[PDB]
């Protein structure tokens, strides 16, 4: 994997109408993968390595967590949101990879963590260090059991 | 002085839609992560994040399940993102050199 850098000219012509994003590191990133539980998530190891590599190449300081219970996810996400480094970085990334249901993801104990609770940890009230800074979340989890059979294109 | 809403400046990419299953290849990993890494590595230099997630959506719409003899053969998935961003989000990778 390689990330093509932006040109100096691209930066000069776009930075004024964009979020400030020039800190080094660009931000902290958290990649939290649950694979062992709800069936074993075969290929979850590939996803995890792919994102760790990607965010490192994008200039993020990457934190990793694996196979966490719902309670541990909550506690460790809160710890992550409260890190002092957020004041001096320009953005934040959180990737969560697990089984899930609409609006929640599973811990390895089969208990659910509500996504609203996750987002709240990073909001303007609870995470003042990230106020006005872009916060990215990527959620790889089912949101229901309905398989999409697909439809014919007319 | 200007105050803030309780929550703002977030963008959330979801592998699938409300009520549906997200697909994962047992060897190659999740369709959504594979697409996300392909697009972001290629385009973060000149495309903002919401626009890159649109490219991810295009890739996911096009893919289909390969799982002969199960309910997942030729199945589909659609990703989405939701945004409370108030500006373009460019990652400006490798700047300054």
């Amino acid at each position: 994997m390689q990330v093509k850098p932006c040109t100096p000219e691209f930066y000069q012509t776009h930075f004024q109408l964009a979020y400030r994003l020039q800190s080094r590191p660009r931000g902290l990133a958290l990649v939290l993968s649950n694979v062992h539980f709800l069936e074993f998530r075969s290929g979850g190891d590939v996803d995890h390595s792919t994102l760790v590599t990607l965010f490192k190449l994008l200039g993020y300081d990457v934190h990793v967590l694996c196979d966490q219970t719902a309670q541990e996810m909550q506690e460790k996400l809160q710890n992550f949101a409260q890190l002092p480094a957020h004041r001096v970085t320009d953005s934040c990334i959180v990737a969560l990879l697990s089984h899930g249901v609409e609006g929640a993801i599973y811990g390895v104990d089969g208990k659910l963590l509500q996504l609203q609770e996750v987002f709240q940890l990073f909001d303007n009230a609870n995470c003042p260090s990230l106020q006005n800074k872009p916060k990215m979340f990527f959620i790889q989890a089912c949101r229901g059991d309905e398989t999409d059979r697909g439809v014919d294109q007319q | 002085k200007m105050r803030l809403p309780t929550r703002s400046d977030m963008i959330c990419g979801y592998a699938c839609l409300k009520g549906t299953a997200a697909m994962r290849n047992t060897k190659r990993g999740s369709w959504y992560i594979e697409a996300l890494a392909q697009v972001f590595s290629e385009r973060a230099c000149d495309m903002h994040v919401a626009d890159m997630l649109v490219k991810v959506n295009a890739l996911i719409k096009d893919r289909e399940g390969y799982a002969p003899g199960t309910e997942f053969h030729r199945c589909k998935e659609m990703s989405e993102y939701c945004s409370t961003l108030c500006r373009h989000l460019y990652l400006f990778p490798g700047h300054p050199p």
Binding site: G100 | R24, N25, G65
Partner: peptide, 5 residues
Amino acid sequence: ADVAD
């Protein structure tokens, strides 16, 4: 093969 998360 493809499976559901």
